[PDB]
Design an enzyme around this catalytic site. Structure first.
Site, PDB file in Angstrom:
ATOM      1  N   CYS A   1       0.848  -1.193   0.000  1.00  0.00           N
ATOM      2  CA  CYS A   1       0.000   0.000   0.000  1.00  0.00           C
ATOM      3  C   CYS A   1       0.885   1.245   0.000  1.00  0.00           C
ATOM      4  CB  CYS A   1      -0.930  -0.034   1.198  1.00  0.00           C
ATOM      5  SG  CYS A   1      -1.335  -1.744   1.596  1.00  0.00           S
ATOM      6  N   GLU A 104       2.098  -3.839  -5.373  1.00  0.00           N
ATOM      7  CA  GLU A 104       2.573  -4.570  -4.209  1.00  0.00           C
ATOM      8  C   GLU A 104       3.730  -5.447  -4.659  1.00  0.00           C
ATOM      9  OE1 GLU A 104      -0.647  -6.647  -2.268  1.00  0.00           O
ATOM     10  OE2 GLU A 104      -1.741  -4.809  -1.789  1.00  0.00           O
TER      11      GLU A 104
END
Ligand SMILES: [Mg+2]
Ligand SMILES: [Mg+2]
Length: 226
Positions: A1, A104
């Site tokens: 994130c 990610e």
DNA sequence: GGTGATTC
């Protein structure tokens, strides 16, 4: 994130959230053009004030004067609403950070493979954010954070955490000043887009370096390398 | 008062 893409035009992101009359946002046809949005930069951030949607360049990071550590860039949904640090931002500083998708890095042995994650139906994503109002002041240290959740279903295959992504409907309700902290918590639990709505592919490892900013960074690799 | 990479 901790990395995402925000490459399309303002209209491409705003069209799903409100009619034009609800915005105080000047027309601009230029794509934002950011393929590797990094922590510690200013990011266009959507919020509601004076009964209209506003877009402000806001520092991605949060470091109040008493915080002598590196700025925080995420807040965990499990605890943010009751955190001594985040509770005032949960109540009065809610906002949305829109994106094409996010990156990610999947750890394998000692190395990583970056993935670009996006909605299979083609829509942009609306990530829940909290931050230090007033956003328009351009603060250099007290900006916004992306709210995170535990990875669900397929996303746990990549990383233990994920951004809290809201439906366009939930994203609009999230921003409203009339909505309380408790009602915000209800929206966060019921509005989180499930992992099955997303697809993902490996992208070039060049995205890891924040100096790299080409449009190729969100594209699938031509050959997966190990 | 808490949660990404870099021939770092
Ligand atoms: Mg080893
Ligand atoms: Mg200040």
């Amino acid at each position: 994130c901790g990395r995402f893409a925000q490459s399309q035009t303002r209209e491409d992101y705003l069209a799903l959230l409100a009619e034009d009359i609800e915005r105080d946002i000047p027309y601009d046809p230029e794509p934002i053009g950011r393929y590797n949005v990094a922590p510690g930069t200013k990011v266009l951030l959507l919020s509601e004030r004076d009964e209209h949607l506003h877009l402000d360049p806001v520092f991605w990071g949060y470091a109040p004067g008493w915080w002598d550590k590196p700025p925080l860039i995420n807040a965990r949904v499990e605890t943010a609403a009751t955190s001594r640090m985040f509770k005032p931002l949960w109540q009065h500083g809610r906002a949305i950070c829109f994106a094409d998708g996010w990156f990610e890095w999947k750890k394998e042995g000692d190395k990583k493979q970056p993935f670009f994650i996006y909605r299979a139906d083609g829509q942009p994503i609306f990530m829940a954010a909290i931050g230090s109002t007033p956003f328009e002041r351009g603060d250099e240290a007290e900006g916004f954070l992306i709210v995170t959740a535990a990875a669900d279903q397929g996303l746990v295959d990549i990383h233990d955490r994920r951004p809290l992504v809201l439906s366009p409907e939930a994203a609009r309700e999230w921003m409203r000043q009339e909505i309380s902290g408790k009602e915000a918590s209800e929206i966060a639990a019921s509005g989180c887009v499930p992992a099955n709505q997303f697809s993902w592919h490996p992208v070039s490892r060049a995205v890891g370096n924040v100096k790299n900013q080409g449009a190729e960074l969100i594209q699938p690799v031509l050959e997966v390398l190990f």
